[PDB]
Amino acid sequence: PEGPELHLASQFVNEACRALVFGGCVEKSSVSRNPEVPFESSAYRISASARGKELRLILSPLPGAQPQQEPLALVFRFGMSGSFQLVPREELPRHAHLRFYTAPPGPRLALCFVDIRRFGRWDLGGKWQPGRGPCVLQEYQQFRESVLRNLADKAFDRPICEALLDQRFFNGIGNYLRAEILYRLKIPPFEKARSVLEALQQSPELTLSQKIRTKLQNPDLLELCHSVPKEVVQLGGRGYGSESGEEDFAAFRAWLRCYGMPGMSSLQDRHGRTIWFQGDPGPLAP
């Protein structure tokens, strides 16, 4: 999954859970190879945030809850089939591998991490993955600066379509977004990454008037690494976790200009991931 989905999933969790009280233990399926979550509280609130391709839950005991329990953070990576679902307690999905149950009063519900393929992962603690860079959606200025300061890194000797998947520098960008972003600027996917980005490197250097004149109609690649996934977010509304998936995917399908589209070219990169593009593949093409 890519950054827009993580963000939209966090939004869903937070808003669905804002007034719910959970209670008891956190239950893992026997089959899941992820870690048991040691946690017990009579009354706790669940909140979420996202950063790139990760989602962080925070489990926060409420006043007077027993036994004593510190807040506990958990960071998820969904994999191909992971999701969060809020379901009636008697309707637990088959492949609900981690579950949180509401306490009374009110209907008996379960927040579930669901994942048929079992490629999703969680770890104990709030820590984001070591080395994953700033989120392209939520941390744009730090993301941009981390790329520009580090352009001498060997990551930028690679073709731009491969560098766009390096999560140290483009946390949140995956295979559909790299296609869409490079297509907007018609940058060949196998141009050398540093050659594409060099001209951006060394705010209130240029004034707003000067940026309106020269930059507004000419967004750069790092700008688009933020704005293109923001389009998907806006498009997603509050559909995550609801019954609107058929309408939502039809809208997504219509939004794509390049990925998987008729007439576009495709090649395999060094990791066997398919890059979609129009026109010249660039000099470093296989």
* Strand 27-28 with 54-61, pairing: unpaired
Decide yes or no: CATH 3.20.190.10 for domain 1-132.
yes
Neighbours of 165 (CB within 10 A): 18
Q: Tell me the binding residues for DNA.
A: 175
Using what technique was this structure determined? Answer: X-ray
Q: Tell me the binding residues.
A: 175
Range(s) for CATH 1.10.8.50 in the chain? Answer: 133-278
DSSP line for 182-203: HHHHT--TTSBHHHHHGGG---
25 Rama class: left (phi>0) / alpha (psi -120 to 50) / beta: beta
Which burial class, exposed, middle or buried, applies to 258 when counting CB atoms under 10 A from its CB (0-12, 13-18, 19+)? buried
Give CA–CA dist 158/173, Å, rounded: 16
In terms of C-beta distances under 8 Å and separation of at least 24 residues, what long-range contacts does 272-281 make, across chains too?
273/165, 273/175, 274/175, 275/161, 275/175, 275/178, 275/179, 275/189, 276/179, 276/183, 277/161, 277/179, 277/182, 277/183, 277/188, 277/189, 278/183, 278/186, 279/186, 279/188, 280/188, 281/188, 281/189, 281/190
Calculate the CA dihedral of residues 195, 197, 202, 203 and round it to 10 degrees.
160
- In one-letter notation, the amino acid at residue 212 is I
Give CA–CA dist 115/83, Å, rounded: 6
Cα–chain center distance at 72: 21
Range(s) for CATH 3.20.190.10 in the chain? Answer: 1-132
Decide yes or no: CATH 1.10.8.50 for domain 133-278.
yes
Q: Are 34 and 122 in contact (CB under 8 A)?
A: yes
Angle at 254 between CA 252 and CA 255, to 5 degrees: 65
CA dihedral (280, 283, 284, 286) positive or negative? positive
SS3 content of the chain, % helix, strand, coil (to 5): 30, 25, 45
Q: Are 263 and 255 in contact (CB under 8 A)?
A: no
The catalytic residue positions are 1-2, 53
Helices and strands (H and E) in the chain: how many: 8, 11
Give the single-character DSSP code of 35: P
